[PDB]
Amino acid sequence: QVQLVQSGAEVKKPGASVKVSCKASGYTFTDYYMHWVRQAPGQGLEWMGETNPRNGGTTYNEKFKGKATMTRDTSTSTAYMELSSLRSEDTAVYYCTIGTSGWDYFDYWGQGTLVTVSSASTKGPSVFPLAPSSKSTSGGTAALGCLVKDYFPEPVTVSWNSGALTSGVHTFPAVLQSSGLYSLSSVVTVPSSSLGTQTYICNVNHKPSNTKVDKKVEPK
């Protein structure tokens, strides 16, 4: 089972540097070249370059030469991508990807790492329950959720019951408030008959602020 696990989202001030890690597992790390792909607003997705994990040898896209520095650690099967002299234009999702065929057509990708470059301070969110009630029921179903209020920068990820609850989940795109802070809601529709026997916990993660909240949503 091939899997590429990248490090969490980060916020860095303009002029700073960030090292994004990509831990490889379920295949021999030294067998395939590690590629880096940027997905920026407007500029879309672009190929940054490749690292031969055997000798550390790198081939870059001219555009990223002097901006990106690719390395790896064979003892930990982790590839790294360091961005220097961060500027607003560097706000993007960075992906590590491989082509298990031996050619450069990518079939396995990391989950991505959102790097936000901002002078504004990081704020962790407050997690509030959206308790189910007679005002959130419809045709035998009950809707409930978690309000993830006042955070900066993006992203907030939400899972339910440590990933075991995926059906009927709607994790909405964040809204930017006039304070410059983001806010999002994550909802789930469940049976109303088993509200007394089932436990619903939203697992909120805001990696830039190290926020890890597991909020139990109680029926009202």
Binding site: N61, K135, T141, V187
Partner: protein
């Protein structure tokens, strides 16, 4: 650098009906081995791209026979013989023949389905938030189609302006519907000054606006 241009930028297709996406490269994309490394990827919001077609026409494992690829020189085409709900997202062509490797701007595929009126839910502020000095009221519009839906916040029947934010989801991969979250935010002091909190929903699936309300302290 080779510029990949996709046509159209977006397309709306009814399930079972065919779809076509073209990719044009600024130069020839014939690799030194004689093969053209032209790939098609599908990406959904919050996810990494998924390989569908590689080397112009070859399909990746698990990819349905509904997807086919063709082309020569500059012109390249992705073809979906019959579109399914799960095909929603953005399609990208990508050349891995010449360094640096380049992607097209993307083609958003949206799918058409019958009108679905929303299930409307309201959520008063939590006691946790009220203690912190703020009151957010959430109005949930679940599984509706088309995406156009109007939410109006009414406090003691008075129409609200400038104190709410909303966002709609991407199109659902299973039932081709949309969901909407709208939040009304007031200070604790302002929230306690009023009794009836309501969100009035307008949608094509509704013959008259539907109101979902609560009385503060019930």
């Amino acid at each position: 650098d080779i510029v990949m241009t996709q046509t159209p930028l977006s397309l709306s297709v009814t399930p079972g009906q065919p779809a076509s996406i073209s990719c044009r490269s600024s130069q020839s994309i014939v690799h030194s081995d004689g093969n053209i490394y032209l790939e098609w990827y599908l990406q959904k919001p919050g996810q990494s791209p998924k390989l569908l077609i590689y080397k112009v026409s070859y399909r990746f494992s698990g990819v349905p026979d509904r997807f086919s690829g063709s082309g020569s020189g500059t012109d390249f085409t992705l073809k979906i013989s019959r579109v399914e709900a799960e095909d929603v997202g953005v399609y990208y062509c990508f050349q891995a023949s010449h360094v640096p490797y380049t992607f097209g701007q993307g083609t958003k595929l949206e799918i058409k389905r019958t009108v679905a009126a929303p299930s409307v839910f309201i959520f008063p502020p939590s006691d946790e938030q009220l203690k912190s000095g703020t009151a957010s009221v959430v109005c949930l519009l679940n599984n509706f189609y088309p995406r156009e839906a109007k939410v109006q916040w009414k406090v003691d029947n008075a129409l609200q302006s400038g104190n709410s934010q909303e966002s709609v989801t991407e199109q659902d991969s299973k039932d081709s519907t949309y969901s909407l979250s709208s939040t009304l935010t007031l200070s604790k002091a302002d929230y306690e000054k009023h009794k009836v909190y309501a969100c009035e929903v307008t949608h094509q699936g509704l013959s008259s606006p539907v109101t979902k309300s609560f009385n503060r302290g019930e």
